[PDB]
Amino acid sequence: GSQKSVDIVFSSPQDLTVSLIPVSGLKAGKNAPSAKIAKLVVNSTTLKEFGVRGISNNVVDSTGTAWRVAGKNTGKEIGVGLSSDSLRRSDSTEKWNGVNWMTFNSNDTLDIVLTGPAQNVTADTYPITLDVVG
């Protein structure tokens, strides 16, 4: 349906502020390689760096910077992940409990895109979750 819900969070000052903005007007069907689908903005007035991974049951690279998401209504999959340009903004990778996290500077916008070759996308809703650690 057209009804939408979202959590509104009020808290004491936090070290990081994370905003994940989806791209509007995405068209089902063939899409361009690395087409942008969302922007992850991590801001901080107090911390210099953070690590970030996409959380998914189908992560496809070691750093959690690429994964696949199945459509809620059809089960069809798309491959998503950070753009190559965004990935270049990372100057180090940290390992935490056997898992690799790429580090980035706060106050930056990282683009989430349709990875690899051009994808033929089925009209559907594809949830994505990004986890940021300061």
Place this chain on the structure above:
Amino acid sequence: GSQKSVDIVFSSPQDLTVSLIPVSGLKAGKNAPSAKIAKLVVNSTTLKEFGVRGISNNVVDSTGTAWRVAGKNTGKEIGVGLSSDSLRRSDSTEKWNGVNWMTFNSNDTLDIVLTGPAQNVTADTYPITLDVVGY
């Protein structure tokens, strides 16, 4: 860590798609009157108008343009609703199936805000729900 989830929507050109974007960094405690908490965006290149109403256990005006939401942890409430500026962009107020709805132009984004006088907000999570119906 700090996690954020959003729906990525791919649709057909005639489809109606709605997006509700929350404001990050909101501060518990006293807030300024009408502080923005979310933005509602409706997408379609063919739809001309839509009605929109908030939904909660305590809707406080006839058109569902103002309501109150209780925090998940504490039960403390906040008053939310369309901003004055957003309300002024309305086309008409119609009644469908015994409920009054205010209508808006597609392409117009609407701001959801802390309504009325300045509110002292308890640190908590407040789910908000906006219902959009193609007119």
